[PDB]
Each structure stands twice: as C-alpha cells, then as structure tokens.
C-alpha cells in the first residue's frame, strides 16, 4: 500500500497554476526518502519539518498540490511571499508545515512558437487566502467604469498565458511544482513512514 506519489510527480499533464490540482493522500505508506534523495529536483525546500524526520512521522492526510509556473516565480511558493503568483494564484500560509518541490520542464512544457495552454491570473479584486483557489473568468474592472462581462478600456480578461518557448532563459522556462502539506487532525493518523509495518518479519 505505497502512497501514489508517482501519479502526482509523473503525471503526464500538469494543471495551470490558477486552477492548481489537489490530490489527497491517505491510508498508504509514505517514503519521502525516495523523493528527497532524487537529484532531478532543482528545488526541495521544507518548512517547519525536516525531510528525513518526515519518514518517522504520522499524519491524518497529506495533500499534494501541483501546477506549472516559470522559474523566477518558484521563489514565490514560500511563506510570506508577495507577487503575482502568491497574491492571485497559489498562496501558502505563514505557518506552512510542508515541502515545496520543483523541477525544470522546458523539454515537456515549451514548444516552438510558444505554448499557450498554461495560464496564470494577472488581476484580482483581493489577494487569495491560503490554499484558496480561484477559477473564475470575470472581466476585471481596473477603473471605475463597470465591465458587465465585456472587454474594454480598463476591463481585462484576467487569465494570461506564459507562451513558454524553448529558447527562453531559464528564469522564464516552465517549472513543474509539487507542494506537500501535512495534516494532523484530532482523528487517527493513516499516513505513516516505511518503518511501520503490519506484516510479520522473520
């Protein structure tokens, strides 16, 4: 009953960041060590918890959040960050207990002429609360004239594509990101590390 992290990290397609995907992990045996010793990840930052100490702990639920952003925004997937991604797209809490994993995906997510499929939110009436997800497409009212569902002066469609292109510098190339957050409820813990087994050993 290994935890299905392969379905998250190796998913053939990744969500746009404004519509970031969440997978709930429960009732399985987690080995964060196979992730931590990988070397394919350019980013593996953990907040609060040590990644090796992670294999010795138990949680009620583990949430895997995945999306694509560009390289120089990966730094925004951290507590206390501001910027277009953290303010309008995916927001980590200041008390974040968990890990941010990222790697470069130019070879999958860029194409000549540009990849327009990946979108981010450029505007919003207010910053997102932590782990809030906004998937709406209302014309954004940048000025005092109401928009009433019509694009116009100071009336903007709020989602915009990166246009990822293979010759872009690395700070502009696409990065796949997995954020792991750990829930300890009052309930029983069902996600434990590999040294907890229910099978007899000889």
């Amino acid at each position: 009953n290994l935890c299905p992290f392969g379905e998250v990290f190796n998913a053939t397609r990744f969500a746009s960041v404004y519509a970031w995907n969440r997978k709930r992990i429960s009732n399985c045996v987690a080995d964060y060590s196979v992730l931590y010793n990988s070397a394919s990840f350019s980013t593996f930052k953990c907040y609060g918890v040590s990644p090796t100490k992670l294999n010795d702990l138990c949680f009620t639920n583990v949430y895997a959040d995945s999306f694509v952003i560009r390289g120089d925004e990966v730094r925004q997937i951290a507590p206390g960050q501001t910027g277009k991604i953290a303010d309008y797209n995916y927001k980590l809490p200041d008390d974040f207990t968990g890990c941010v994993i990222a790697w470069n995906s130019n070879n999958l997510d860029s194409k000549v002429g540009g990849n327009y499929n990946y979108l981010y939110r450029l505007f919003r009436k207010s910053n997102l609360k932590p782990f809030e997800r906004d998937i709406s497409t209302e014309i954004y009212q940048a000025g005092s004239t109401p928009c009433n569902g019509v694009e116009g002066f100071n009336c903007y469609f709020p989602l915009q594509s990166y246009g990822f292109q293979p010759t872009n510098g690395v700070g502009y190339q696409p990065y796949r990101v997995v954020v792991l957050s750990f829930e300890l409820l009052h309930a029983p813990a069902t996600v434990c590390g590999p040294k907890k087994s229910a099978a007899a050993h000889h």
Partner: single-chain antibody
Amino acid sequence: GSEVQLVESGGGVVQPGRSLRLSCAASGFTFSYYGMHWVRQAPGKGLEWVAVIWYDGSNRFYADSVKGRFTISRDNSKSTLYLQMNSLRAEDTAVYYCATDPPGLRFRFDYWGQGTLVTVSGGSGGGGSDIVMTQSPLSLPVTPGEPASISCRSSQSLLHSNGYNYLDWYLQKPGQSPQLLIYLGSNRASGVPDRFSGSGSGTDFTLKISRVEAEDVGVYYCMQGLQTPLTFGGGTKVEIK
C-alpha cells in the same frame, strides 16, 4: 478608449545593411499591462506582422523574415516600445505601426499608431505550419445603403477548446492606419457601429455590413491570433460603385 495614443518615430531613408531604431511613445493607458506588436505595410501591399513582446518584457516572438536581424524591447517606465532593425534589406521597406494587445485571450491588435515610413533605398513558411488566411473577394464595389458581405477562410481551425474563435477583422480606411473592427470572431470593438457583424467558426468566417455607408470604404483584413506567426489575409477592397 479614445485617448489612447501611439506615436512612432525613428523612420527614415537608410542604405541596405545599416541599422535603425524605431520608437513608439504610448500614452493614455496602463502601458505595462499590454503586450506590444510591430506590424508593417510595404507601399501598396497588405499588412505583415513583425514581432511581439509580452507586457513584462519576458517573452518575444519574431516573424521568420526578421528573425535575428530585428530585436523588440520595451521600457515600461518610459511607456515606450522599440524596434532595433539591423542588416536592413530592400524588402524591409515599409510603414511600421505599433499596436497594443490586451491581457489574455492570446493575440489582438486593438489600438494602432500612425506609422513611421522606413525606406531602404500569405505563405505557410518553410515547414508549412504557418496559418494561411484567404479572403474573398479581392474587391467589392458597393452601392450606398445596400448590404455587403466578405469572407475569410483559414488553412487551420481557429476554434479552440475554450470555445473561442481567434479571428479578428481589421479595417484600413483610405490613407489611414488600420483599426480593429471585430475581435474573437463576433465581438464588436468599442465604437464600431452595429451595422457591422462578424460570424463563422473553425475555418470559415464572414463579415457583413447591413447597410454600407461611404465612411465604411477601405480595405478589410482578417487575421488569426491563435498562434505565432500572426498572419493576415490579402485584404478586400470595399469601394463605392
């Protein structure tokens, strides 16, 4: 909307092989939210897209005929767009327009400048994947007050899973710079009278004028904004009979 101003400079007469830098001073709107384009028109010819730069400078695309020789850049703190042209050739001779592109929904030229003239004294490209736009008819003599319709087919579907058709129509009145008429297949631009309407989907599109007025005379172009390079039709000349 009416107060948007784009003012190109830098044009002149230069020898082949020399360099020239175009400028476009923008006022009247938040320049740093818009992508910016250069579009050119050789004398007596249609419109040809040149280059685009993302609202924040992070991303640029070029037409193949200018790849490497031209560089597009911008200074958001001076609200100015630039075109650095190197190794000028005779075929580069044209009027160069800057145009704005609003956030989202891929490509659109919703405000145009005046042009600078640069004097150096419709194909699918080498690989065949560039979208070709074909318009019909070439000229359309019209009597005032009677309807008009013109058509545009594209070599590739402009319908996306979005449900959007990335097709626009642009009008160039005689002696004027082009202007947006219809965007995304069927939406009128601000101020376009309701006697204009665009229809169609996928690969076949039509523009209809319910009752042509003499101020509607010009050359109408279709254009796809689905992917780069951005490509225009050959244009349809609407004139009074």
